[PDB]
Amino acid sequence: HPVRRAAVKILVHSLFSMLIMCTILTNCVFMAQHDPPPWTKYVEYTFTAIYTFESLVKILARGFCLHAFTFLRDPWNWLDFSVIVMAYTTEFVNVSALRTFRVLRALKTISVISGLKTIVGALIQSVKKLADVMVLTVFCLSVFALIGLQLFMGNLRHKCVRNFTELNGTNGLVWNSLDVYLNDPANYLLKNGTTDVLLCGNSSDAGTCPEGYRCLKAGENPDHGYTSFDSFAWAFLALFRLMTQDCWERLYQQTLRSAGKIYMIFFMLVIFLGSFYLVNLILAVVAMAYEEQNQATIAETEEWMSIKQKVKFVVMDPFADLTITMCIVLNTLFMALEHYNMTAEFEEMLQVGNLVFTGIFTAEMTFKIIALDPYYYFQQGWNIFDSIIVILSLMELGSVLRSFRLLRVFKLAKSWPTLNTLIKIIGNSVGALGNLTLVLAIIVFIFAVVGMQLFGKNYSELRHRISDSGLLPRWHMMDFFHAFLIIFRILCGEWIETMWDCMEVSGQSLCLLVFLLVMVIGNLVVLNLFLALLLSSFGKVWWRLRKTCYRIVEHSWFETFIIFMILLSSGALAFEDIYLEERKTIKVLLEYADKMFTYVFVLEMLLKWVAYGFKKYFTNAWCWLDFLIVDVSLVSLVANTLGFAEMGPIKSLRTLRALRPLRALSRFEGMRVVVNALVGAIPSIMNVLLVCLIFWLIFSIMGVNLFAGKFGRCINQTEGDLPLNYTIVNNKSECESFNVTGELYWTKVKVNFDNVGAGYLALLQVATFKGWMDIMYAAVDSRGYEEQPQWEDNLYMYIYFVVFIIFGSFFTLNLFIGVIIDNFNQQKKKTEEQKKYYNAMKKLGSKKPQKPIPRPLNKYQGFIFDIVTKQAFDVTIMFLICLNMVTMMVETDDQSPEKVNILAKINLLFVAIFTGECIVKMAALRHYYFTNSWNIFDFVVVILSIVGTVLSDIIQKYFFSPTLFRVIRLARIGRILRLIRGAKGIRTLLFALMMSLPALFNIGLLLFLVMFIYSIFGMANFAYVKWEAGIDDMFNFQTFANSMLCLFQITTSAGWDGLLSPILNTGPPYCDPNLPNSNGSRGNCGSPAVGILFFTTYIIISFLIVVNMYIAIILENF
């Protein structure tokens, strides 16, 4: 047919493809709109027509029903098939939610662009290769969800309820008990500094409600209802949230607040294993799928002219590009000397300096135009780049626009190889890997418009249930930009806090579905891009005495003695909390112990000397460490007795006593090798930190140009939380004219962009996503210069942070991890009890045994033997234990008496089934319960089950203990762990985990030591800090246990902004200096210099230790 040939010619032709691509792109910019005008309706029709034409033009090219089979064989056209079907249905003949379907059109260009379909296809293999670790992750999450459910069932419903005294007449204190104390939130007491209920616990480790507030379980719900441990669904959600570490510290502090501080152990166990280990397993198998597919593709590929003479003679030898790099460095350094309150002459000086720098660059640019050839400038990319910045600078001479000089610092890339490694990464992100980035871009676009069509009217109408008062939420999906922002925040790792609000406004089923799909798919494709970037960038008495001391120092008892003194002295350090003032006996006890310690360590020093020699002593680095610390101690003692004591610097120098635990590093052959292999990689960390400091210098100068001085608030003193209305108070100066009453305080935000240093602090709080909320809120409210912030004026400043997060957090991370990996390779190329652990893992880890047991050949014995052996018996007892698991999942809080009756009956039924299996099994012939470790394991669990049943039988008659039940019942969890015998994936993964826990023990020991040093430092400084955002009555630095809680929390980087926040404040509107402090000190202030030092250094050292050591572990396992 002629129409057949015509349709085929249109099909193969390439102008049709670009026509449909432009049509899709315009339909995209038309989907991304909310509140479309009527002039859009025909446009809809328009698109419909074109797509239908596509359909015809292809099916008329097919021809028949066999051709229709071949056409539908490629699945991609099923999409626009459904698209035109839905179009005809909606245009011929409602819930109004069908409009959400045409976003499928946006996926069409993945099949139209022949490169994108390759990506979205090659991204399918890993998610079905993720199966083994996915079921291991679901299995561990469900195990720990049962554990957490049994431990904390209805614990999060504890509330510091007010005091209720019951009345005689029953059946403003007048009320009813339950209907008033369950649905009444008036009765509860809010947490200090929040509109959030206070939790409590009857235990002596939980929150202590103030006088006048008892503490019960009769409460509304958890925060919005979604953080319960009450059911297995809610508990599985809570443990998923703690696995992804999304706001996990909030659940940590809530649970410890109600359950007790000792359950801290639980949380660390679920972080040291749940978050870290399961997440890292998923990540490592994705990395393995990536390596495998890339090597698979690599294998598939393996299948007047006088004046010309004079000027060219003058420009023969420029030879001064080094002076140009120096002038660039001076230019950035000169731009960096910009701050908030600059004098007029200093501003004029900076302007003249950058003017003369522009002159320098313009002059040598026009010289380089005539130095070689304008075809040379047409040739090289660097020269094009400097030409661009010159034109942009002259445009400046003709807030965002001044910053384009900053790219000049990138000119250092030619001499700073790690900087050009960074730019190679950024050039692959949109170069050789442009398709991955483009796929991610259209996926974020699809998710943004899908979410906005699904949730726009919800977010817009029911906003009253999502914000404080008649006012907007900071995060929503009504506009496309805010939907993109929700998606981007999710990609950053914050999906629970906006999911709560979405489900509060929209609906749990659909919102859960979409946010979990966004998180899974987006984090998967972002990990794909991350890994792809990482892969694309790849007389004799004197001598007699000396040998006497040489004998006295090498004696093992001497070494154990000094180790014990080290440990005792550090433990003595731990006793230095705020309660020594009333501890009179142990005060002087610790005084004498301290002087004994310095004397014994200095005598040890002198004997080391006289034995080994001064050159043999002062060459060892750890001996230098010991000498330095004993020097600290000696000077402290000397100035303590020989006058000039409690004198400023000398009385604050004994704070350095907290370094005393560092003596332990040299002794233990685990910490020593760890610190060796760690400081052996400080040069790489230093050069990468230099590249990151230059990049964040760029971004901090941008933030100082954009909003420096625009972060002030002018809070009203009574309210305190929020700022003020622009209408009423507009300027900082009007904040000082209406200030006839001293309630107005023009405060900055704690972390702002006022210097390059405050810029660096804000960029660290944004790059870790802790504390960035207030940064970005004060930035997208930044109206004027000293002007009061309008609620979302300058809304597009979000872009700044987004861009920074992409270049300063994503790519720099690709830098960090990058060098680390390669660093280790070169170190790869160039505790004896743990060796015995190794040897025993070799010894008793016997895999294949001999013939286990022969048939007893008796009538009953042989029959029971034969019914025990067949694998059908194994699979059915596994089905039985899985049914026990499910009947374990059906337990909730405050369920009912009859249901718990039934559940206890089924409990006895199941322990009976399994103990019958046990009595049949040990009688296999004689030796079933001796050969395999699994049989004796289930033997232990079955006897534990029988003893648990009889303990449940003897609750009160013989002897009673209230809390122990909750843990003996927890032994039932052991039964589900019996499933580890059947599965092969999770068993091998958990065994390879248990093989490496000596290494994790050494790493956790170094981490514990760093926590100990920083706990003592914070006990010295950060006690008496005002109780604010992240420092409550339970997570302090007051005691040592509180310090360990705070520091374990921060070790995951979580909530570190909320703890640094009360260390920064220094003013009367927040602090109270001159406060009658109980100790020698005064004032409840933090000290910003050492607070920033402490927290930034602590999170950076913990990040470095964890990253370095975990990559070492992962490489040594590989």
Ligand SMILES: CCCNC[C@@H](O)COc1ccccc1C(=O)CCc1ccccc1
């Ligand atoms: C993408 C992970 C999502 N969940 C974790 C994050 O939320 C924060 O985790 C951390 C908490 C404390 C210190 C460091 C980290 C890290 O990021 C290092 C992870 C890591 C693991 C193994 C090998 C290299 C690096």
